[PDB]
Each structure stands twice: as structure tokens, then as C-alpha cells.
Design a protein around this motif. Structure first.
Motif, PDB file in Angstrom:
ATOM      1  N   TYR A  33       0.829  -1.222   0.000  1.00 11.76           N
ATOM      2  CA  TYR A  33       0.000   0.000   0.000  1.00 11.76           C
ATOM      3  C   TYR A  33       0.860   1.268   0.000  1.00 11.76           C
ATOM      4  CZ  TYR A  33      -4.447  -2.375   1.804  1.00 11.76           C
ATOM      5  OH  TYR A  33      -5.591  -3.159   2.008  1.00 11.76           O
TER       6      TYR A  33
ATOM      7  N   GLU B 224       2.992   2.522   2.618  1.00 17.96           N
ATOM      8  CA  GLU B 224       3.231   3.222   3.877  1.00 17.96           C
ATOM      9  C   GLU B 224       4.232   2.501   4.770  1.00 17.96           C
ATOM     10  OE1 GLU B 224      -0.467   3.334   3.352  1.00 17.96           O
ATOM     11  OE2 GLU B 224      -0.529   5.494   2.881  1.00 17.96           O
TER      12      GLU B 224
ATOM     13  N   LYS C 283      -1.915   4.117  11.661  1.00 14.21           N
ATOM     14  CA  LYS C 283      -2.401   3.396  10.500  1.00 14.21           C
ATOM     15  C   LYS C 283      -2.121   1.885  10.659  1.00 14.21           C
ATOM     16  CE  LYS C 283      -3.974   4.657   6.185  1.00 14.21           C
ATOM     17  NZ  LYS C 283      -2.735   4.874   5.378  1.00 14.21           N
TER      18      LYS C 283
ATOM     19  N   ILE D  51      -4.821  -1.037  10.426  1.00 13.09           N
ATOM     20  CA  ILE D  51      -4.751  -2.102   9.402  1.00 13.09           C
ATOM     21  C   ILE D  51      -4.787  -3.483  10.050  1.00 13.09           C
ATOM     22  CG2 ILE D  51      -3.324  -3.157   7.580  1.00 13.09           C
ATOM     23  CD1 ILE D  51      -2.455  -0.446   6.785  1.00 13.09           C
TER      24      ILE D  51
ATOM     25  N   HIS E 166      -8.449  -3.967  11.322  1.00 13.53           N
ATOM     26  CA  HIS E 166      -9.310  -4.251  10.170  1.00 13.53           C
ATOM     27  C   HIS E 166      -9.113  -5.632   9.616  1.00 13.53           C
ATOM     28  CE1 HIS E 166     -10.256  -4.106   5.801  1.00 13.53           C
ATOM     29  NE2 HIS E 166     -11.313  -3.390   6.205  1.00 13.53           N
TER      30      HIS E 166
ATOM     31  N   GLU F  63      -9.079  -9.030   1.656  1.00 15.38           N
ATOM     32  CA  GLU F  63      -8.155  -8.191   2.389  1.00 15.38           C
ATOM     33  C   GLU F  63      -6.992  -9.043   2.898  1.00 15.38           C
ATOM     34  OE1 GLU F  63      -8.306  -4.654   3.187  1.00 15.38           O
ATOM     35  OE2 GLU F  63      -6.373  -4.999   4.098  1.00 15.38           O
TER      36      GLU F  63
ATOM     37  N   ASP G 187     -13.401  -6.419   0.601  1.00 12.92           N
ATOM     38  CA  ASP G 187     -12.694  -7.168   1.660  1.00 12.92           C
ATOM     39  C   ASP G 187     -13.055  -8.629   1.731  1.00 12.92           C
ATOM     40  OD1 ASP G 187     -11.247  -5.079   2.800  1.00 12.92           O
ATOM     41  OD2 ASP G 187     -13.168  -4.320   3.657  1.00 12.92           O
TER      42      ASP G 187
ATOM     43  N   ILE H 112     -15.682  -3.954   4.482  1.00 12.02           N
ATOM     44  CA  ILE H 112     -15.653  -3.763   5.913  1.00 12.02           C
ATOM     45  C   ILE H 112     -15.012  -2.444   6.255  1.00 12.02           C
ATOM     46  CG2 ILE H 112     -14.864  -4.581   8.166  1.00 12.02           C
ATOM     47  CD1 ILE H 112     -16.804  -6.487   6.936  1.00 12.02           C
TER      48      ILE H 112
ATOM     49  N   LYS I 290     -17.478   5.525   2.749  1.00 10.82           N
ATOM     50  CA  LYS I 290     -17.302   4.310   1.975  1.00 10.82           C
ATOM     51  C   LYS I 290     -18.219   4.222   0.789  1.00 10.82           C
ATOM     52  CE  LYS I 290     -14.273   1.816   4.158  1.00 10.82           C
ATOM     53  NZ  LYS I 290     -12.949   1.587   3.554  1.00 10.82           N
TER      54      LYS I 290
ATOM     55  N   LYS J 117     -17.125   6.560  -1.878  1.00  4.84           N
ATOM     56  CA  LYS J 117     -15.867   6.115  -2.470  1.00  4.84           C
ATOM     57  C   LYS J 117     -16.023   4.928  -3.428  1.00  4.84           C
ATOM     58  CE  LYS J 117     -11.442   4.159  -0.861  1.00  4.84           C
ATOM     59  NZ  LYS J 117     -10.891   3.527   0.365  1.00  4.84           N
TER      60      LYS J 117
HETATM   61  O1  LIG Z   1      -4.240   1.952  -0.136  1.00  6.84           O
HETATM   62  C1  LIG Z   1      -4.663   1.717   0.995  1.00  6.84           C
HETATM   63  C2  LIG Z   1      -5.806   0.915   1.317  1.00  6.84           C
HETATM   64  C3  LIG Z   1      -6.141   0.725   2.596  1.00  6.84           C
HETATM   65  N1  LIG Z   1      -5.449   1.297   3.640  1.00  6.84           N
HETATM   66  C4  LIG Z   1      -5.865   1.060   5.030  1.00  6.84           C
HETATM   67  O2  LIG Z   1      -6.211  -0.307   5.159  1.00  6.84           O
HETATM   68  C5  LIG Z   1      -7.354  -0.442   6.060  1.00  6.84           C
HETATM   69  C6  LIG Z   1      -8.479  -1.203   5.391  1.00  6.84           C
HETATM   70  O3  LIG Z   1      -8.940  -0.522   4.209  1.00  6.84           O
HETATM   71  P1  LIG Z   1     -10.430  -0.706   3.651  1.00  6.84           P
HETATM   72  O4  LIG Z   1     -10.484  -2.154   3.247  1.00  6.84           O
HETATM   73  O5  LIG Z   1     -11.492  -0.475   4.645  1.00  6.84           O
HETATM   74  O6  LIG Z   1     -10.329   0.215   2.496  1.00  6.84           O
HETATM   75  C7  LIG Z   1      -7.694   0.967   6.525  1.00  6.84           C
HETATM   76  O7  LIG Z   1      -7.092   1.203   7.789  1.00  6.84           O
HETATM   77  C8  LIG Z   1      -7.120   1.844   5.420  1.00  6.84           C
HETATM   78  O8  LIG Z   1      -6.831   3.155   5.850  1.00  6.84           O
HETATM   79  C9  LIG Z   1      -4.338   2.089   3.407  1.00  6.84           C
HETATM   80  O9  LIG Z   1      -3.687   2.601   4.300  1.00  6.84           O
HETATM   81  N2  LIG Z   1      -4.013   2.252   2.084  1.00  6.84           N
END
Ligand SMILES: O=c1ccn([C@@H]2O[C@H](COP(=O)(O)O)[C@@H](O)[C@H]2O)c(=O)[nH]1
Ligand SMILES: [Mn+2]
Ligand SMILES: [Mn+2]
Length: 199
Positions: free
Chosen positions: A26, A28, A36, A40, A43, A82, A110, A122, A136, A139
Motif C-alpha cells: 500500500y 506506507e 495506521k 490495518i 481491520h 483483504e 474485503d 468492511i 465508503k 468512495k
Molecule cells: O491503499 C490503501 C488501502 C487501505 N489502507 C488502510 O487499510 C485499512 C483497510 O482498508 P479498507 O479495506 O477499509 O479500504 C484501513 O485502515 C485503510 O486506511 C491504506 O492505508 N491504504
């Protein structure tokens, strides 16, 4: 205790590794974007928990099975998207769309629900559930992906008030999120974690 140290004590090391690999893919840095990283991990774990114990029997019916039975070798009710890297995530979404005929999303969701025949996105938020839901939905102009949002305070909101799972499965998820919040508070990390979330 730094957030980075909390994450490693709070989450199973397999979750931490899958979360680290996702962050890097991703783009980061887990050692910098520590809130974050916690998010992650949380999640991803919630995605695994959603799927745990739900299966499709040989008669095509959705049933629950909590015994981790060595002979329980049934098809899972959910597929998890995910935690997979993009190549493998699209591989699975493509297979699902082939095998079931459902519309292919333009974004990676996900989960896929084999009973309801729909993808699930999710959300886990420290903010308000309704606003995160709308974020969401906005988006992903998809409209065929089901949205299910959890907060750490135990609120939830899902598309058409359809929560997919039985109450007990959701409470299992909500209990884990209660715990994470509680443990963060004890190490004085919650305030930072909560204010750090952004849209
Ligand atoms: O390019 C991405 C996609 C997702 N997330 C992080 O991954 C988690 C799950 O993302 P989502 O499946 O709800 O989009 C969240 O904490 C989201 O901020 C990122 O940091 N970058
Ligand atoms: Mn995702
Ligand atoms: Mn998600």
C-alpha cells in the motif's frame, strides 16, 4: 509504550506480518505511520473474524461450525480478499466472478459472501459510524458491494440494515474491538489513535 510496541503485543504475529506486507504494498511505513498500522491490523483481524466458523455445506446451505474439526473440510461461506496482495486479490475476485456470475467490482472489496452472493466492504472506525458509512459508499459508487461498518464503541451500520451475520458473530467482533480500545486506553494510546483517523 509506543503504538508500534502495543501493536506487536496486542495482535497475533501472523496478523502483524500480513498487515506489514499490506502496508508496504500500500506504500506506507509501519514504523512511521503507527496509528495506521494498528488500524490495518485491527481491520484485517476483523475481516478474519467475520469469516471464522461460517461454512457452506455439501447441500449448499450456510451453517455455523465452531469446533475446529480435523474432518471439517468444507467450503467457507466467505472468501477473504483483504490481506492479499493486489495480484492475488484480483485473482480471487476474478475466480469468484467466474464461479458465481456476480458483477465484478471496480475496487477490491474485503470479503465475498457465497450465501448472499455479494462482496462486502468492511469498515472499522474510531469516528462516527454513519459518516464512515457514507464515506465508503461515496468512495465506491459500486452499489452492489455491501457495506458493513464497526466502531470500537460497539455501534454498527450496514447496507439496508442487513448485518449479514447472526448477532453472536457480530458480538464476537465487537468484543475484540472493545478489548483493543480498553487495552489502548490503559497504555494511554487511545486518545492519539482516535484523533489520528482521517477521511
Ligand atoms: O491503499 C490503501 C488501502 C487501505 N489502507 C488502510 O487499510 C485499512 C483497510 O482498508 P479498507 O479495506 O477499509 O479500504 C484501513 O485502515 C485503510 O486506511 C491504506 O492505508 N491504504
Ligand atoms: Mn480492503
Ligand atoms: Mn475495508
Amino acid at each position: 509504550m509506543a503504538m508500534e510496541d502495543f501493536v506487536r503485543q496486542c495482535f497475533n504475529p501472523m496478523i502483524v506480518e500480513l498487515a506489514e506486507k499490506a502496508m508496504k504494498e500500500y506504500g506506507e511505513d509501519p514504523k512511521i505511520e503507527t496509528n495506521k498500522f494498528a488500524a490495518i491490523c485491527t481491520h484485517l483481524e476483523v475481516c478474519f473474524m467475520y469469516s471464522d466458523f461460517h461454512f457452506i455445506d455439501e447441500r449448499g446451505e450456510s451453517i455455523i461450525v465452531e469446533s475446529g474439526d480435523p474432518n471439517a473440510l468444507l467450503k467457507h461461506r466467505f472468501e477473504i480478499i483483504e490481506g492479499r496482495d493486489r495480484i492475488m486479490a484480483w485473482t480471487v475476485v476474478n475466480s469468484i466472478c467466474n464461479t458465481t456470475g456476480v458483477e465484478k467490482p471496480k475496487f477490491l472489496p474485503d470479503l465475498y459472501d457465497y450465501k448472499e452472493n455479494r462482496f462486502i466492504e468492511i469498515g472499522v472506525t474510531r469516528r462516527e459510524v454513519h459518516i464512515y458509512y457514507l464515506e465508503k459508499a461515496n468512495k465506491i459508487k459500486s452499489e452492489k458491494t455491501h457495506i458493513h461498518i464497526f466502531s470500537f464503541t460497539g455501534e454498527e451500520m450496514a447496507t439496508k440494515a442487513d448485518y449479514t451475520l447472526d448477532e453472536e458473530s457480530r458480538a464476537r467482533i465487537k468484543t475484540r474491538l472493545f478489548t483493543i480500545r480498553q487495552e489502548m486506553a490503559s497504555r494511554s494510546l487511545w486518545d492519539s489513535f482516535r484523533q489520528s483517523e482521517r477521511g
